[PDB]
Amino acid sequence: MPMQMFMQVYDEIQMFLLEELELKFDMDPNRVRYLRKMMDTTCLGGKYNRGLTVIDVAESLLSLSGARRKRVLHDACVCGWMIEFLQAHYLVEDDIMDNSHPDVTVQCAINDGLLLKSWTHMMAMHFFADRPFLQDLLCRFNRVDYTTAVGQLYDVTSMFDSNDFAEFTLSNYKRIVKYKTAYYTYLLPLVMGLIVSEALPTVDMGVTEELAMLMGEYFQVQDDVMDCFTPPERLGKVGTDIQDAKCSWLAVTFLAKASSAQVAEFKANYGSGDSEKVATVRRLYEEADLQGDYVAYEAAVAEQVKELIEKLRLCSPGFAASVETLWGKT
Amino acid sequence: MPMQMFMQVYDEIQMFLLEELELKFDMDPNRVRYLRKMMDTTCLGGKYNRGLTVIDVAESLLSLSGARRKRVLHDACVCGWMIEFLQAHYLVEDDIMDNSHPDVTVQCAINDGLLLKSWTHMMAMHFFADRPFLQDLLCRFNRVDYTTAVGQLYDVTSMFDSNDFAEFTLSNYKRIVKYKTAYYTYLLPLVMGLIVSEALPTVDMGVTEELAMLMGEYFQVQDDVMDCFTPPERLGKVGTDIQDAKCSWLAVTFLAKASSAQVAEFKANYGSGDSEKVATVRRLYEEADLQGDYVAYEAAVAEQVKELIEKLRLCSPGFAASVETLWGKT
Ligand SMILES: CCN(CC)S(=O)(=O)c1ccc(C)cc1
Ligand SMILES: CCN(CC)S(=O)(=O)c1ccc(C)cc1
Ligand code: NA
Ligand code: NA
Secondary structure, eight states: OHHHHHHHHHHHHHHHHHHHHHHHSOOOHHHHHHHHHHHHHHHSSSOOHHHHHHHHHHHHHSSOOOHHHHHHHHHHHHHHHHHHHHHHHHHHHHHHHHHOOOOHHHHHHHHHHHHHHHHHHHHHHHHTTTOTTHHHHHHHHHHHHHHHHHHHHHHHTTTSOOOOOTTOSHHHHHHHHIIIIIIIIIIHHHHHHHHHTTOGGGSOHHHHHHHHHHHHHHHHHHHHHHHHHSOHHHHSSOOOTTTTTOOOHHHHHHHHHOOHHHHHHHHHHTTOOOHHHHHHHHHHHHHTTHHHHHHHHHHHHHHHHHHHHHHHHHHOHHHHHHHHHHHHHO | OHHHHHHHHHHHHHHHHHHHHHHHSOOOHHHHHHHHHHHHHHHSSSOOHHHHHHHHHHHHHSSOOOHHHHHHHHHHHHHHHHHHHHHHHHHHHHHHHHHOOOOHHHHHHHHHHHHHHHHHHHHHHHHTTTOTTHHHHHHHHHHHHHHHHHHHHHHHTTTSOOOOOTTOSHHHHHHHHIIIIIIIIIIHHHHHHHHHTTOGGGSOHHHHHHHHHHHHHHHHHHHHHHHHHSOHHHHSSOOOTTTTTOOOHHHHHHHHHOOHHHHHHHHHHTTOOOHHHHHHHHHHHHHTTHHHHHHHHHHHHHHHHHHHHHHHHHHOHHHHHHHHHHHHHO
């Protein structure tokens, strides 16, 4: 029922967007079918955890505050696809960075990125045209999107000086995770579920923001370790954080407990594509027992999460049930 | 006074955006100064015709409907910078297409494009937080931005089949100009001036949209001819429409009046970087007396413009004065 309803609304949203182009933007069928394929390629095939989270928050709040149910659930599905389209937009933008007479494939990739973002506005302005929260929804959505772009800047420049391992600290690592990932992956689905359920001013936002940041941190630390030690055919991709000189949890944790000569060896081998230098970094990580510290770090974070949901439950019990399910996914 | 007030509000807007990053997004001074420089580089130095148009529409409506004057004029200046920032965003996106181990300059260019667009939302949500039109403003702004991205798609793919001179027609040329340029360069400043002046539902939008499309068409046809025949040091850039196989006014007009063998020669030489083939295309344009048809075409368009402003003047006299000044700039 959850996934089945999410996919039906996708068909409804897609048909509105494509018919709107046909009927109001003078688009020819060849381009409509081209955009239908591009939308399917970029928005479908993931796990939809951000979008389904909106629905779960919505159903948990109509059980503890007929016609309002069906409407709130449909609005939750449209909000779920807003985030999924936003995620598709970020992935297209991220491919343009590493993918490389006018090059029409790069022109169309840039265009795809612009269309996917604009589609989030177009579907909200249509399906929520008569909702009292449309203005608040757009503002909280645009602010989270801005937050993510700022987080991207923090991440991309963490090894230089914007016109260098000084910013390789744990507090800066958390700032990157917070802005680049946590706000739109964990906080935004929860907020949108509260908005369509009319129960936004009934929750402790501070505890909610604190939980979203902590859950993103838990997820990103595990992602950083898997990027380094999980082999490609099991991870799903080729891990590249060492070659890309990423400010990863492994890198900042190693620098805190390495000897002066190891730091020299780390700094000499980090951020290179050579197989031996990458392997030297993995050797340094192993010999520093980082995968031992990884277990303890996540355990402590999980304790802060498992104990922060209860504060939220004292005044928002239905909210905390969905936050627990979202945490269980992490 | 007009330009002097527009630049003061720029300083106010910039200081809010940068302080917001410092105070609410945890941004370090090195990055704040980096973004201040990027903002100055991308948003300043143009002619500001889109942004000043908002102010001119605003002042023409407070003269024919003290505290309301100063507020509406400040709101007009913020709306003017929204469009200017949006223009800066499109130019950054356009540079990524032709500008080309992670390449941090391309990463920062993509990031710049995202920040410039998000800044349009952030400045509107702040300076219009207590305005009744904030929601309508955001929706009309997002729809025009969407319109421009659709126009980009029409332009970039006018020579292929989205997975070829069939789309080299005058009606398709107008569709490209309408969506890619006219809506955000001519219609959007007028609309925003009406929104902040509270006089939006007091004008004939059909005549207004018709004028915006016609003015963009007039401007783009002149731009197409200058791109081909005005030498680079006088045009300000190297004209590249022939090499890029653009659907220009010259190309669609030539195909309507060329002989079968000339079309073969045109099709054989169009869309190539070779100096002789580009010169052959210029030779074909000259021998077809296109710069003679150019004068007549603009004259006829100017007549439709000079006569459409009067319809708008019968019910919106103050509006038509600013539209005349905007047309005079064209
Ligand atoms: C603004 C997003 N950024 C790219 C412009 S990003 O932070 O690198 C990013 C890339 C991909 C994903 C799924 C999320 C974020
Ligand atoms: C969405 C805009 N497009 C780029 C993504 S564009 O139509 O090519 C364009 C480029 C530059 C300018 C100033 C205007 C439009
Ligand atoms: Na998701
Ligand atoms: Na301008």
